[PDB]
């Protein structure tokens, strides 16, 4: 019992993205819908390999949203370039100052700007969209950020500025290489690696310092 051919706009046979156990997302076909216990499960046959039975927060539509349809806090899958499809949260919507991109805070802590054609809406997000973020530090951060929005204290940094930036519990000598909207590209001077970090993050010493006085 409990088999369904549709659940609103989720129709058996549609194209879909599904979350694999690797936490990367892959294209496939929605092959079944079933009510099991408190909710529905969605069976996905992936194009490349495999089948999965997934909750509604672990499938995404195979289309890009009209930008207008997404908000800060929206649950999305986005192209994670360091390319994979990975889940995250919309932290900022398109504006001229961000070159009309979405800022994504990914589930592992990564941040990037993506274009409108690089994200996919999760089909049935949780009402509090951060509640399915596995990493508790990430989960807590997103709840704080979304709840506080649009109050976003940020540090004004300039290319060439020297600051300490936190990473793995250590505060490292670092240099500001570039500013891009709400992100700064930080060069870690000891190891020579760059990281794009949110300008409101307390990993940046000036933000840490302010929050610690403040609280």
């Amino acid at each position: 019992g409990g088999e369904l051919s549709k659940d609103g706009d989720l129709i058996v046979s549609m194209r879909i993205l599904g979350k694999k156990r690797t936490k990367t997302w892959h294209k496939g076909t929605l092959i079944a819908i079933q009510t099991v216990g408190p909710g529905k499960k969605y069976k996905v046959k992936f194009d490349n390999k495999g089948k999965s039975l997934l909750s509604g927060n672990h499938i995404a539509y195979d289309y890009h949203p009209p930008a207008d349809k997404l908000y800060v806090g929206s649950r999305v899958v986005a192209k994670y370039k360091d390319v994979w499809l990975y889940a995250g949260i919309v932290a900022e919507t398109p504006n001229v100052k961000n070159k009309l991109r979405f800022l994504i805070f990914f589930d592992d802590g990564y941040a990037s700007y993506v274009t409108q054609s690089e994200l996919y809406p999760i089909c049935r997000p949780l009402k509090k969209t951060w509640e399915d973020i596995e990493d508790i530090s990430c989960r807590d951060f997103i709840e704080e950020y979304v709840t506080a929005y649009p109050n976003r204290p940020m540090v004004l940094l300039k290319s060439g500025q020297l600051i300490k930036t936190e990473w793995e519990g250590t505060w490292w000598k670092s240099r500001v290489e570039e500013v891009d909207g709400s992100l700064v590209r930080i060069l870690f001077l000891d190891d020579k690696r760059c990281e794009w970090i949110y300008r409101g993050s307390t990993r940046l010493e000036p933000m840490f310092s302010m929050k610690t006085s403040s609280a």
């Binding site: 530090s137 936190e166 990281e195």
Partner: peptide, 9 residues
């Protein structure tokens, strides 16, 4: 690689 959004606890 990523250090996430807040310092390590």
């Amino acid at each position: 690689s990523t250090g996430g959004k807040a310092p390590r606890k």
